[PDB]
Design an enzyme around this catalytic site. Structure first.
Site, PDB file in Angstrom:
ATOM      1  N   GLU A   1      -4.247  -9.207  -1.333  1.00  0.00           N
ATOM      2  CA  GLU A   1      -4.873  -9.035  -0.030  1.00  0.00           C
ATOM      3  C   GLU A   1      -6.354  -8.755  -0.250  1.00  0.00           C
ATOM      4  OE1 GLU A   1      -2.787  -6.385   2.977  1.00  0.00           O
ATOM      5  OE2 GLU A   1      -4.880  -5.764   3.300  1.00  0.00           O
TER       6      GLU A   1
ATOM      7  N   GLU B   1       0.809  -1.207   0.000  1.00  0.00           N
ATOM      8  CA  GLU B   1       0.000   0.000   0.000  1.00  0.00           C
ATOM      9  C   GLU B   1       0.853   1.272   0.000  1.00  0.00           C
ATOM     10  OE1 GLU B   1      -3.452  -0.168   2.563  1.00  0.00           O
ATOM     11  OE2 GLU B   1      -4.074  -2.037   1.556  1.00  0.00           O
TER      12      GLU B   1
ATOM     13  N   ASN C   1     -12.500 -11.370  -9.867  1.00  0.00           N
ATOM     14  CA  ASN C   1     -11.066 -11.356 -10.154  1.00  0.00           C
ATOM     15  C   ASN C   1     -10.714 -12.314 -11.301  1.00  0.00           C
ATOM     16  OD1 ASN C   1      -8.880  -9.870  -8.249  1.00  0.00           O
ATOM     17  ND2 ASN C   1     -10.875 -10.080  -7.260  1.00  0.00           N
TER      18      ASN C   1
ATOM     19  N   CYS D   1     -10.057  -8.343   2.306  1.00  0.00           N
ATOM     20  CA  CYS D   1     -10.671  -8.482   3.621  1.00  0.00           C
ATOM     21  C   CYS D   1     -12.022  -7.785   3.661  1.00  0.00           C
ATOM     22  CB  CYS D   1      -9.785  -7.944   4.728  1.00  0.00           C
ATOM     23  SG  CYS D   1      -9.665  -6.138   4.713  1.00  0.00           S
TER      24      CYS D   1
END
Ligand SMILES: *[C@@H]1O[C@H](CO)[C@@H](O[C@@H]2O[C@H](CO)[C@@H](O)[C@H](O)[C@H]2NC(C)=O)[C@H](O)[C@H]1NC(C)=O
Ligand code: NAG
Ligand code: NAG
Ligand code: A1IBC
Ligand code: K
Ligand code: K
Length: 498
Positions: A340, A235, A370, A342
Protein backbone atom coordinates in the site's frame (compact mmCIF):
# COMPACT_ATOMS: atom_id res chain seq x y z
CA UNK A 1 -2.65 6.01 -30.14
CA UNK A 2 -4.51 8.94 -28.52
CA UNK A 3 -2.65 11.83 -26.83
CA UNK A 4 -3.30 13.44 -23.40
CA UNK A 5 -5.98 16.20 -23.30
CA UNK A 6 -4.35 18.40 -20.67
CA UNK A 7 -6.12 20.46 -18.06
CA UNK A 8 -4.60 22.68 -15.35
CA UNK A 9 -6.14 23.20 -11.92
CA UNK A 10 -3.43 25.70 -10.83
CA UNK A 11 -0.96 23.10 -9.50
CA UNK A 12 2.54 22.59 -10.97
CA UNK A 13 1.42 20.40 -13.88
CA UNK A 14 -1.63 19.08 -15.72
CA UNK A 15 -4.02 16.20 -15.53
CA UNK A 16 -5.15 14.28 -18.57
CA UNK A 17 -8.91 14.48 -19.05
CA UNK A 18 -10.84 11.38 -20.03
CA UNK A 19 -14.59 10.96 -20.55
CA UNK A 20 -17.16 8.80 -22.32
CA UNK A 21 -15.70 9.32 -25.84
CA UNK A 22 -12.04 10.02 -25.25
CA UNK A 23 -9.09 8.84 -23.28
CA UNK A 24 -5.36 8.85 -23.93
CA UNK A 25 -3.99 5.50 -24.87
CA UNK A 26 -0.99 3.79 -26.37
CA UNK A 27 -0.65 1.76 -29.52
CA UNK A 28 -0.31 -2.00 -29.02
CA UNK A 29 3.11 -2.53 -27.43
CA UNK A 30 5.99 -3.20 -29.85
CA UNK A 31 9.73 -3.19 -29.21
CA UNK A 32 12.06 -0.89 -31.12
CA UNK A 33 14.14 -2.45 -33.93
CA UNK A 34 17.27 -4.31 -32.66
CA UNK A 35 19.94 -1.54 -32.69
CA UNK A 36 17.23 0.99 -31.74
CA UNK A 37 15.94 2.10 -28.31
CA UNK A 38 12.53 3.44 -27.22
CA UNK A 39 12.20 6.38 -24.84
CA UNK A 40 8.96 7.22 -23.08
CA UNK A 41 9.03 10.67 -21.55
CA UNK A 42 6.80 12.51 -19.07
CA UNK A 43 7.57 16.07 -17.95
CA UNK A 44 6.16 18.66 -15.58
CA UNK A 45 5.86 20.93 -18.62
CA UNK A 46 3.16 18.50 -19.79
CA UNK A 47 4.56 15.58 -21.82
CA UNK A 48 2.77 12.32 -20.87
CA UNK A 49 4.61 9.06 -21.70
CA UNK A 50 5.47 10.36 -25.19
CA UNK A 51 7.37 7.88 -27.37
CA UNK A 52 10.59 8.67 -29.23
CA UNK A 53 13.20 6.30 -30.66
CA UNK A 54 16.95 6.58 -31.04
CA UNK A 55 19.98 4.61 -32.22
CA UNK A 56 22.17 2.48 -30.04
CA UNK A 57 25.69 3.58 -30.94
CA UNK A 58 28.90 1.51 -31.06
CA UNK A 59 31.04 4.38 -29.74
CA UNK A 60 31.11 7.01 -26.98
CA UNK A 61 33.51 9.86 -26.08
CA UNK A 62 33.26 12.50 -23.30
CA UNK A 63 33.44 12.95 -19.51
CA UNK A 64 29.69 13.27 -19.17
CA UNK A 65 27.63 11.13 -16.83
CA UNK A 66 27.68 7.46 -17.82
CA UNK A 67 25.32 4.85 -16.34
CA UNK A 68 26.68 1.40 -17.12
CA UNK A 69 24.28 -1.51 -17.11
CA UNK A 70 25.43 -4.51 -15.07
CA UNK A 71 23.23 -7.14 -16.71
CA UNK A 72 24.90 -10.08 -14.87
CA UNK A 73 24.64 -8.43 -11.46
CA UNK A 74 21.20 -9.79 -10.57
CA UNK A 75 18.94 -8.74 -7.71
CA UNK A 76 15.25 -9.47 -7.03
CA UNK A 77 12.59 -10.81 -9.42
CA UNK A 78 9.55 -8.53 -9.75
CA UNK A 79 6.05 -9.67 -8.95
CA UNK A 80 4.45 -6.52 -10.39
CA UNK A 81 2.44 -3.37 -9.85
CA UNK A 82 -1.14 -2.48 -9.18
CA UNK A 83 -3.65 -0.87 -6.85
CA UNK A 84 -6.58 -1.49 -4.47
CA UNK A 85 -10.19 -2.25 -5.35
CA UNK A 86 -11.69 -0.71 -2.23
CA UNK A 87 -15.39 -0.06 -1.83
CA UNK A 88 -14.63 3.63 -2.54
CA UNK A 89 -12.76 2.82 -5.77
CA UNK A 90 -15.52 0.50 -6.94
CA UNK A 91 -18.27 3.08 -6.18
CA UNK A 92 -16.36 5.80 -8.00
CA UNK A 93 -15.68 3.64 -11.06
CA UNK A 94 -19.28 2.43 -11.29
CA UNK A 95 -20.64 6.02 -10.91
CA UNK A 96 -19.16 6.67 -14.36
CA UNK A 97 -21.09 5.87 -17.54
CA UNK A 98 -20.31 2.41 -19.01
CA UNK A 99 -18.03 3.88 -21.73
CA UNK A 100 -16.07 5.96 -19.20
CA UNK A 101 -15.84 2.94 -16.85
CA UNK A 102 -14.30 0.92 -19.71
CA UNK A 103 -11.77 3.61 -20.57
CA UNK A 104 -10.79 3.92 -16.89
CA UNK A 105 -10.28 0.18 -16.51
CA UNK A 106 -8.40 0.04 -19.87
CA UNK A 107 -6.14 2.82 -18.60
CA UNK A 108 -4.97 0.64 -15.79
CA UNK A 109 -5.24 -2.98 -17.01
CA UNK A 110 -4.89 -3.15 -20.77
CA UNK A 111 -1.79 -3.06 -22.99
CA UNK A 112 -3.23 0.23 -24.36
CA UNK A 113 -2.86 1.49 -20.78
CA UNK A 114 -0.22 0.91 -18.08
CA UNK A 115 -0.49 -2.92 -17.65
CA UNK A 116 -1.32 -3.34 -13.93
CA UNK A 117 -1.09 -6.98 -12.85
CA UNK A 118 -1.94 -6.74 -9.11
CA UNK A 119 -5.25 -5.94 -7.43
CA UNK A 120 -5.47 -5.65 -3.64
CA UNK A 121 -8.94 -6.61 -2.31
CA UNK A 122 -10.03 -5.64 1.21
CA UNK A 123 -11.70 -8.47 3.13
CA UNK A 124 -14.94 -6.65 3.99
CA UNK A 125 -15.04 -2.99 5.08
CA UNK A 126 -12.28 -0.49 5.64
CA UNK A 127 -12.01 3.34 5.96
CA UNK A 128 -12.57 3.57 2.15
CA UNK A 129 -16.06 2.17 2.62
CA UNK A 130 -19.38 3.92 3.24
CA UNK A 131 -20.83 1.05 5.32
CA UNK A 132 -19.20 -0.84 8.14
CA UNK A 133 -19.67 -4.60 7.83
CA UNK A 134 -17.84 -7.88 8.04
CA UNK A 135 -18.73 -11.14 6.28
CA UNK A 136 -19.89 -12.76 9.58
CA UNK A 137 -21.71 -10.16 11.69
CA UNK A 138 -24.14 -12.65 13.24
CA UNK A 139 -22.68 -13.22 16.75
CA UNK A 140 -21.28 -16.46 18.15
CA UNK A 141 -21.29 -18.17 14.73
CA UNK A 142 -17.98 -19.93 15.43
CA UNK A 143 -18.42 -22.42 12.57
CA UNK A 144 -19.26 -19.40 10.27
CA UNK A 145 -22.38 -20.97 8.82
CA UNK A 146 -23.72 -17.39 8.19
CA UNK A 147 -20.53 -16.23 6.42
CA UNK A 148 -21.56 -14.53 3.15
CA UNK A 149 -20.45 -11.88 0.69
CA UNK A 150 -22.65 -8.80 0.56
CA UNK A 151 -23.44 -6.68 -2.48
CA UNK A 152 -20.25 -4.58 -1.97
CA UNK A 153 -18.48 -7.75 -3.20
CA UNK A 154 -21.02 -9.52 -5.41
CA UNK A 155 -22.38 -6.47 -7.26
CA UNK A 156 -19.44 -3.98 -7.11
CA UNK A 157 -15.98 -5.37 -6.45
CA UNK A 158 -16.21 -8.80 -8.06
CA UNK A 159 -17.73 -7.74 -11.38
CA UNK A 160 -15.14 -4.98 -11.71
CA UNK A 161 -12.30 -7.39 -10.96
CA UNK A 162 -13.69 -9.73 -13.66
CA UNK A 163 -13.80 -6.81 -16.09
CA UNK A 164 -10.16 -5.84 -15.29
CA UNK A 165 -9.06 -9.45 -15.86
CA UNK A 166 -10.85 -9.55 -19.25
CA UNK A 167 -8.98 -6.41 -20.37
CA UNK A 168 -5.62 -7.65 -19.13
CA UNK A 169 -3.23 -9.62 -21.32
CA UNK A 170 -0.88 -10.02 -18.34
CA UNK A 171 -1.99 -12.56 -15.72
CA UNK A 172 -3.40 -10.59 -12.80
CA UNK A 173 -2.60 -11.52 -9.18
CA UNK A 174 -5.08 -10.75 -6.38
CA UNK A 175 -3.98 -9.89 -2.83
CA UNK A 176 -6.45 -9.90 0.07
CA UNK A 177 -6.14 -8.08 3.38
CA UNK A 178 -8.55 -7.79 6.30
CA UNK A 179 -9.01 -4.68 8.46
CA UNK A 180 -11.27 -6.05 11.21
CA UNK A 181 -12.81 -9.30 12.30
CA UNK A 182 -16.42 -9.63 13.35
CA UNK A 183 -16.85 -7.62 16.58
CA UNK A 184 -17.92 -10.70 18.62
CA UNK A 185 -14.34 -12.07 18.16
CA UNK A 186 -12.77 -8.86 19.56
CA UNK A 187 -11.86 -7.77 23.10
CA UNK A 188 -13.56 -4.34 22.64
CA UNK A 189 -16.64 -5.53 20.69
CA UNK A 190 -16.29 -2.72 18.12
CA UNK A 191 -14.86 -2.51 14.57
CA UNK A 192 -12.50 0.36 15.60
CA UNK A 193 -10.74 1.50 18.78
CA UNK A 194 -8.11 -0.42 20.65
CA UNK A 195 -8.82 -4.14 20.47
CA UNK A 196 -7.51 -7.52 19.45
CA UNK A 197 -8.89 -11.03 19.07
CA UNK A 198 -10.15 -12.45 22.31
CA UNK A 199 -8.19 -15.18 24.00
CA UNK A 200 -4.94 -16.55 22.68
CA UNK A 201 -3.67 -18.11 19.46
CA UNK A 202 -4.79 -21.74 19.14
CA UNK A 203 -8.15 -21.09 20.80
CA UNK A 204 -11.69 -20.93 19.38
CA UNK A 205 -11.55 -17.18 18.64
CA UNK A 206 -8.28 -17.49 16.68
CA UNK A 207 -9.34 -20.70 14.93
CA UNK A 208 -12.57 -18.96 13.87
CA UNK A 209 -10.64 -15.99 12.55
CA UNK A 210 -8.31 -18.27 10.54
CA UNK A 211 -11.37 -20.12 9.18
CA UNK A 212 -12.80 -16.77 8.07
CA UNK A 213 -9.86 -16.39 5.70
CA UNK A 214 -10.60 -19.78 4.10
CA UNK A 215 -14.34 -18.88 3.90
CA UNK A 216 -13.37 -15.67 2.09
CA UNK A 217 -11.18 -17.55 -0.38
CA UNK A 218 -13.90 -20.17 -0.87
CA UNK A 219 -16.52 -17.48 -1.55
CA UNK A 220 -14.37 -15.64 -4.10
CA UNK A 221 -13.51 -19.05 -5.70
CA UNK A 222 -17.26 -19.65 -6.25
CA UNK A 223 -17.06 -16.42 -8.32
CA UNK A 224 -14.07 -17.91 -10.25
CA UNK A 225 -11.48 -15.62 -8.54
CA UNK A 226 -8.31 -17.10 -7.01
CA UNK A 227 -5.79 -15.23 -4.88
CA UNK A 228 -2.01 -15.04 -5.17
CA UNK A 229 -1.55 -13.94 -1.54
CA UNK A 230 -3.24 -12.78 1.65
CA UNK A 231 -1.80 -10.61 4.34
CA UNK A 232 -2.14 -11.65 7.97
CA UNK A 233 -3.84 -8.29 8.90
CA UNK A 234 -3.84 -4.76 7.50
CA UNK A 235 -1.77 -2.52 9.79
CA UNK A 236 -1.74 -4.77 12.87
CA UNK A 237 -0.06 -2.03 14.95
CA UNK A 238 -3.14 0.24 14.51
CA UNK A 239 -5.44 -1.86 16.72
CA UNK A 240 -3.02 -1.41 19.64
CA UNK A 241 -3.79 2.35 19.71
CA UNK A 242 -6.38 3.90 22.00
CA UNK A 243 -9.15 5.59 19.97
CA UNK A 244 -8.06 4.21 16.59
CA UNK A 245 -10.75 5.78 14.37
CA UNK A 246 -11.65 3.01 11.89
CA UNK A 247 -11.61 -0.74 11.26
CA UNK A 248 -8.61 -2.43 12.83
CA UNK A 249 -7.47 -5.50 14.71
CA UNK A 250 -4.45 -5.16 16.91
CA UNK A 251 -1.55 -7.64 17.02
CA UNK A 252 1.83 -7.29 18.69
CA UNK A 253 4.49 -9.03 16.65
CA UNK A 254 4.50 -11.91 19.16
CA UNK A 255 0.68 -12.20 18.75
CA UNK A 256 0.99 -12.21 14.96
CA UNK A 257 3.81 -14.81 15.21
CA UNK A 258 1.70 -17.17 17.28
CA UNK A 259 -1.47 -16.59 15.23
CA UNK A 260 0.42 -17.49 12.06
CA UNK A 261 2.14 -20.53 13.63
CA UNK A 262 -0.85 -21.97 15.48
CA UNK A 263 -3.86 -20.91 13.37
CA UNK A 264 -3.56 -19.11 10.05
CA UNK A 265 -0.58 -21.03 8.64
CA UNK A 266 -1.94 -24.52 9.42
CA UNK A 267 -5.51 -23.57 8.38
CA UNK A 268 -4.43 -22.24 4.96
CA UNK A 269 -2.04 -25.19 4.44
CA UNK A 270 -4.86 -27.71 5.18
CA UNK A 271 -7.21 -26.03 2.68
CA UNK A 272 -7.68 -26.26 -1.08
CA UNK A 273 -6.11 -22.76 -1.03
CA UNK A 274 -2.71 -24.03 0.18
CA UNK A 275 -0.98 -22.38 -2.85
CA UNK A 276 -2.05 -18.92 -1.62
CA UNK A 277 0.99 -17.12 -0.17
CA UNK A 278 0.93 -15.53 3.28
CA UNK A 279 2.53 -12.11 3.78
CA UNK A 280 3.28 -10.79 7.29
CA UNK A 281 3.39 -7.21 8.72
CA UNK A 282 1.33 -5.22 6.11
CA UNK A 283 2.39 -2.08 7.95
CA UNK A 284 4.86 0.78 8.08
CA UNK A 285 8.59 0.21 7.65
CA UNK A 286 9.77 1.49 11.10
CA UNK A 287 8.38 -1.77 12.52
CA UNK A 288 11.24 -3.52 10.65
CA UNK A 289 13.48 -5.28 11.26
CA UNK A 290 12.02 -5.92 14.76
CA UNK A 291 8.77 -7.49 13.47
CA UNK A 292 10.62 -9.72 11.01
CA UNK A 293 12.95 -10.83 13.80
CA UNK A 294 10.08 -11.70 16.11
CA UNK A 295 8.10 -13.67 13.52
CA UNK A 296 10.77 -15.25 11.31
CA UNK A 297 13.15 -16.46 14.09
CA UNK A 298 10.32 -18.77 15.24
CA UNK A 299 10.63 -21.76 12.91
CA UNK A 300 6.98 -22.72 13.42
CA UNK A 301 5.82 -19.34 12.08
CA UNK A 302 8.60 -18.93 9.57
CA UNK A 303 7.60 -22.06 7.61
CA UNK A 304 4.26 -20.36 6.72
CA UNK A 305 5.48 -16.84 5.88
CA UNK A 306 6.28 -16.24 2.20
CA UNK A 307 6.92 -12.50 2.37
CA UNK A 308 6.78 -9.24 4.24
CA UNK A 309 4.25 -6.60 3.14
CA UNK A 310 5.16 -2.94 3.77
CA UNK A 311 3.03 0.22 3.59
CA UNK A 312 4.41 3.57 2.37
CA UNK A 313 2.78 6.80 3.58
CA UNK A 314 4.70 9.00 1.19
CA UNK A 315 3.95 12.21 3.16
CA UNK A 316 5.97 10.97 6.12
CA UNK A 317 9.73 10.54 6.66
CA UNK A 318 11.27 7.23 7.74
CA UNK A 319 14.58 5.42 7.20
CA UNK A 320 14.98 2.88 4.31
CA UNK A 321 18.42 1.36 4.88
CA UNK A 322 17.85 0.72 8.62
CA UNK A 323 14.41 -0.87 7.89
CA UNK A 324 14.21 -2.58 4.46
CA UNK A 325 17.97 -2.86 4.07
CA UNK A 326 18.51 -4.48 7.44
CA UNK A 327 15.51 -6.77 6.91
CA UNK A 328 16.92 -8.01 3.59
CA UNK A 329 20.35 -8.56 5.22
CA UNK A 330 18.88 -10.62 8.07
CA UNK A 331 16.20 -12.49 6.03
CA UNK A 332 17.42 -12.51 2.42
CA UNK A 333 15.14 -15.46 1.47
CA UNK A 334 11.91 -13.74 2.59
CA UNK A 335 10.64 -11.39 -0.14
CA UNK A 336 9.64 -7.79 0.62
CA UNK A 337 6.56 -6.41 -1.12
CA UNK A 338 5.00 -2.93 -0.98
CA UNK A 339 1.28 -3.55 -0.46
CA UNK A 340 0.00 0.00 0.00
CA UNK A 341 1.21 3.49 -0.79
CA UNK A 342 -0.53 6.82 -0.70
CA UNK A 343 -0.10 10.52 -0.58
CA UNK A 344 -2.35 13.38 0.62
CA UNK A 345 -3.20 11.86 3.97
CA UNK A 346 -2.04 14.82 6.18
CA UNK A 347 -5.13 16.74 7.34
CA UNK A 348 -3.57 20.12 6.42
CA UNK A 349 -2.80 19.37 2.78
CA UNK A 350 -5.40 19.15 0.07
CA UNK A 351 -6.30 15.47 -0.23
CA UNK A 352 -6.56 15.77 -3.99
CA UNK A 353 -4.19 18.12 -5.77
CA UNK A 354 -5.14 17.87 -9.45
CA UNK A 355 -2.02 17.98 -11.54
CA UNK A 356 0.61 17.86 -8.75
CA UNK A 357 3.98 16.95 -10.28
CA UNK A 358 5.46 16.79 -6.79
CA UNK A 359 3.10 13.98 -5.80
CA UNK A 360 4.00 12.19 -9.04
CA UNK A 361 7.73 12.46 -8.16
CA UNK A 362 6.91 11.07 -4.72
CA UNK A 363 5.39 7.96 -6.32
CA UNK A 364 8.30 7.34 -8.73
CA UNK A 365 11.00 8.15 -6.18
CA UNK A 366 9.24 5.69 -3.82
CA UNK A 367 9.11 2.99 -6.42
CA UNK A 368 12.81 3.44 -7.32
CA UNK A 369 13.73 3.42 -3.62
CA UNK A 370 11.69 0.24 -3.08
CA UNK A 371 13.30 -1.50 -6.02
CA UNK A 372 16.84 -0.51 -4.90
CA UNK A 373 16.07 -2.07 -1.52
CA UNK A 374 15.06 -5.44 -3.02
CA UNK A 375 11.27 -4.99 -2.92
CA UNK A 376 9.48 -7.23 -5.50
CA UNK A 377 6.32 -5.23 -6.18
CA UNK A 378 4.43 -2.04 -5.50
CA UNK A 379 0.74 -1.63 -4.88
CA UNK A 380 -0.99 1.70 -4.85
CA UNK A 381 -3.97 2.36 -2.59
CA UNK A 382 -7.44 3.28 -4.00
CA UNK A 383 -7.64 2.84 -7.82
CA UNK A 384 -9.95 5.88 -8.11
CA UNK A 385 -11.38 8.52 -5.75
CA UNK A 386 -13.73 11.48 -6.01
CA UNK A 387 -12.44 15.09 -5.98
CA UNK A 388 -12.67 15.15 -2.14
CA UNK A 389 -10.46 12.02 -1.97
CA UNK A 390 -13.35 9.87 -0.94
CA UNK A 391 -15.78 8.46 -0.11
CA UNK A 392 -14.48 7.48 3.31
CA UNK A 393 -16.71 7.01 6.35
CA UNK A 394 -14.28 8.69 8.79
CA UNK A 395 -13.37 11.42 6.26
CA UNK A 396 -9.77 10.07 6.06
CA UNK A 397 -9.42 11.40 2.50
CA UNK A 398 -6.29 10.94 0.36
CA UNK A 399 -5.12 11.36 -3.25
CA UNK A 400 -5.44 8.76 -6.05
CA UNK A 401 -3.90 8.44 -9.51
CA UNK A 402 -7.38 8.70 -11.06
CA UNK A 403 -9.99 11.20 -9.86
CA UNK A 404 -13.61 10.78 -11.00
CA UNK A 405 -15.98 13.73 -11.52
CA UNK A 406 -19.40 12.24 -11.96
CA UNK A 407 -21.08 15.60 -12.62
CA UNK A 408 -19.06 15.86 -15.87
CA UNK A 409 -18.86 12.06 -16.53
CA UNK A 410 -15.13 12.68 -16.61
CA UNK A 411 -12.10 11.25 -14.91
CA UNK A 412 -8.71 12.84 -14.51
CA UNK A 413 -5.38 11.00 -14.74
CA UNK A 414 -2.94 12.56 -12.25
CA UNK A 415 0.85 12.85 -12.69
CA UNK A 416 0.97 9.96 -10.17
CA UNK A 417 -0.75 7.73 -12.81
CA UNK A 418 2.07 8.35 -15.32
CA UNK A 419 4.85 8.11 -12.73
CA UNK A 420 3.51 4.67 -11.72
CA UNK A 421 3.01 3.72 -15.41
CA UNK A 422 6.73 4.40 -16.20
CA UNK A 423 7.30 1.26 -14.16
CA UNK A 424 4.10 -0.83 -14.44
CA UNK A 425 3.83 -0.68 -18.20
CA UNK A 426 7.45 -1.68 -18.87
CA UNK A 427 8.27 -4.21 -16.14
CA UNK A 428 6.56 -7.56 -16.77
CA UNK A 429 6.18 -10.03 -13.93
CA UNK A 430 9.36 -12.06 -13.64
CA UNK A 431 11.63 -9.18 -14.66
CA UNK A 432 14.80 -9.08 -12.61
CA UNK A 433 16.46 -5.98 -11.28
CA UNK A 434 20.06 -5.59 -12.39
CA UNK A 435 22.86 -3.23 -11.53
CA UNK A 436 23.36 0.23 -12.97
CA UNK A 437 26.57 2.03 -12.02
CA UNK A 438 27.01 5.86 -12.31
CA UNK A 439 30.45 7.10 -13.46
CA UNK A 440 30.12 10.28 -11.33
CA UNK A 441 27.99 11.83 -8.60
CA UNK A 442 24.67 13.10 -9.96
CA UNK A 443 21.16 14.18 -8.89
CA UNK A 444 19.28 11.46 -10.78
CA UNK A 445 17.35 8.49 -9.48
CA UNK A 446 17.54 5.39 -11.72
CA UNK A 447 16.86 1.65 -11.81
CA UNK A 448 17.57 -1.03 -14.43
CA UNK A 449 15.83 -4.34 -14.98
CA UNK A 450 15.94 -7.20 -17.40
CA UNK A 451 12.74 -8.68 -18.84
CA UNK A 452 12.17 -12.49 -18.75
CA UNK A 453 13.03 -12.51 -22.50
CA UNK A 454 16.36 -10.67 -21.89
CA UNK A 455 15.27 -7.16 -22.97
CA UNK A 456 16.46 -4.11 -20.97
CA UNK A 457 14.44 -1.43 -19.24
CA UNK A 458 15.86 1.60 -17.44
CA UNK A 459 13.84 4.25 -15.59
CA UNK A 460 15.42 7.62 -14.96
CA UNK A 461 13.81 10.25 -12.67
CA UNK A 462 15.07 13.80 -12.49
CA UNK A 463 13.66 15.61 -9.48
CA UNK A 464 16.05 18.59 -10.14
CA UNK A 465 15.39 21.68 -12.24
CA UNK A 466 18.52 21.04 -14.39
CA UNK A 467 18.66 19.14 -17.70
CA UNK A 468 21.29 16.39 -17.28
CA UNK A 469 22.88 14.96 -20.44
CA UNK A 470 23.82 11.32 -19.93
CA UNK A 471 24.78 8.17 -21.70
CA UNK A 472 23.59 4.68 -20.85
CA UNK A 473 26.14 2.00 -21.66
CA UNK A 474 24.99 -1.56 -22.24
CA UNK A 475 28.30 -3.37 -22.31
CA UNK A 476 27.03 -6.06 -24.73
CA UNK A 477 25.08 -3.74 -27.02
CA UNK A 478 26.37 -0.13 -27.18
CA UNK A 479 25.56 3.36 -25.97
CA UNK A 480 22.31 5.29 -25.63
CA UNK A 481 23.01 9.04 -25.79
CA UNK A 482 20.25 10.95 -24.14
CA UNK A 483 19.23 13.74 -21.85
CA UNK A 484 17.28 13.77 -18.57
CA UNK A 485 15.36 17.06 -18.58
CA UNK A 486 14.63 18.79 -15.30
CA UNK A 487 11.37 17.60 -13.69
CA UNK A 488 11.11 14.61 -15.99
CA UNK A 489 10.80 10.86 -15.92
CA UNK A 490 11.96 8.60 -18.74
CA UNK A 491 11.69 4.92 -19.42
CA UNK A 492 14.20 3.39 -21.89
CA UNK A 493 13.62 -0.01 -23.52
CA UNK A 494 15.77 -2.00 -25.91
CA UNK A 495 16.45 -5.50 -27.22
CA UNK A 496 19.81 -7.01 -26.27
CA UNK A 497 21.60 -9.08 -28.96
CA UNK A 498 24.45 -11.32 -27.73
C1 LIG B 1 -15.01 14.15 -24.23
O1 LIG B 1 -13.83 14.92 -24.31
C2 LIG B 1 -13.47 15.22 -25.66
C3 LIG B 1 -12.09 15.85 -25.66
O2 LIG B 1 -12.11 17.13 -25.04
C4 LIG B 1 -14.55 16.11 -26.26
O3 LIG B 1 -14.23 16.28 -27.64
C5 LIG B 1 -13.80 17.60 -27.97
O4 LIG B 1 -14.87 18.53 -28.05
C6 LIG B 1 -14.46 19.89 -28.27
C7 LIG B 1 -15.71 20.77 -28.25
O5 LIG B 1 -16.62 20.31 -29.25
C8 LIG B 1 -13.71 19.99 -29.60
O6 LIG B 1 -13.13 21.29 -29.80
C9 LIG B 1 -12.59 18.96 -29.64
O7 LIG B 1 -12.02 18.92 -30.95
C10 LIG B 1 -13.10 17.57 -29.32
N1 LIG B 1 -11.99 16.63 -29.31
C11 LIG B 1 -12.05 15.42 -29.80
C12 LIG B 1 -10.76 14.64 -29.68
O8 LIG B 1 -13.04 14.93 -30.30
C13 LIG B 1 -15.89 15.41 -26.17
O9 LIG B 1 -16.94 16.31 -26.56
C14 LIG B 1 -16.21 14.92 -24.77
N2 LIG B 1 -17.33 14.00 -24.79
C15 LIG B 1 -18.42 14.13 -24.03
C16 LIG B 1 -19.45 13.05 -24.19
O10 LIG B 1 -18.56 15.06 -23.26
C1 NAG C 1 34.01 3.95 -33.70
O1 NAG C 1 35.30 3.73 -33.12
C2 NAG C 1 36.46 3.39 -33.91
C3 NAG C 1 37.57 4.32 -33.41
O2 NAG C 1 38.82 4.07 -34.05
C4 NAG C 1 36.33 3.51 -35.44
O3 NAG C 1 37.00 2.41 -36.06
C5 NAG C 1 34.89 3.56 -35.94
O4 NAG C 1 34.83 3.94 -37.32
C6 NAG C 1 34.15 4.57 -35.07
N1 NAG C 1 32.89 5.01 -35.66
C7 NAG C 1 31.81 4.25 -35.81
C8 NAG C 1 30.64 4.94 -36.45
O5 NAG C 1 31.75 3.07 -35.48
C1 NAG D 1 -8.80 -29.60 7.22
O1 NAG D 1 -9.49 -29.77 5.97
C2 NAG D 1 -10.69 -30.57 5.97
C3 NAG D 1 -11.35 -30.49 4.60
O2 NAG D 1 -10.89 -31.58 3.78
C4 NAG D 1 -11.67 -30.12 7.05
O3 NAG D 1 -12.80 -31.00 7.12
C5 NAG D 1 -10.97 -30.09 8.40
O4 NAG D 1 -11.87 -29.66 9.43
C6 NAG D 1 -9.78 -29.14 8.31
N1 NAG D 1 -9.12 -29.06 9.60
C7 NAG D 1 -8.93 -27.94 10.30
C8 NAG D 1 -9.41 -26.63 9.74
O5 NAG D 1 -8.37 -27.97 11.38
O1 A1IBC E 1 7.89 -3.32 -21.58
S1 A1IBC E 1 7.02 -4.02 -22.47
O2 A1IBC E 1 7.44 -5.26 -23.05
N1 A1IBC E 1 5.66 -4.33 -21.66
C1 A1IBC E 1 4.85 -5.51 -21.97
C2 A1IBC E 1 4.29 -5.47 -23.36
C3 A1IBC E 1 3.30 -6.52 -23.77
C4 A1IBC E 1 4.68 -6.54 -24.34
C5 A1IBC E 1 6.63 -2.91 -23.78
C6 A1IBC E 1 7.20 -3.10 -25.03
C7 A1IBC E 1 6.90 -2.24 -26.05
C8 A1IBC E 1 6.03 -1.19 -25.84
C9 A1IBC E 1 5.46 -1.00 -24.60
C10 A1IBC E 1 5.76 -1.86 -23.57
K1 K F 1 -23.06 -12.68 6.68
K1 K G 1 -5.72 15.46 3.40
Amino acid sequence: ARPCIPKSFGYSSVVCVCNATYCDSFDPPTFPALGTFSRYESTRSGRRMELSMGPIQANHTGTGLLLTLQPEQKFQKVKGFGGAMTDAAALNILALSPPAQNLLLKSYFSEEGIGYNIIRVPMASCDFSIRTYTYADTPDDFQLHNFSLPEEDTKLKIPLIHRALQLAQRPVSLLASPWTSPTWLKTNGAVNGKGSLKGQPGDIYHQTWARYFVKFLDAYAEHKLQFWAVTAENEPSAGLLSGYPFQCLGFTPEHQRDFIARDLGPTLANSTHHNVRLLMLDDQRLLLPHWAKVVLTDPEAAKYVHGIAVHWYLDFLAPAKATLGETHRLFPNTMLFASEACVGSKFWEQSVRLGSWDRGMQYSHSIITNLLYHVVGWTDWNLALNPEGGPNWVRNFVDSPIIVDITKDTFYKQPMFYHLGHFSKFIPEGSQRVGLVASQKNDLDAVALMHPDGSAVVVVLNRSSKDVPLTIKDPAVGFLETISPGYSIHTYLWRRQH
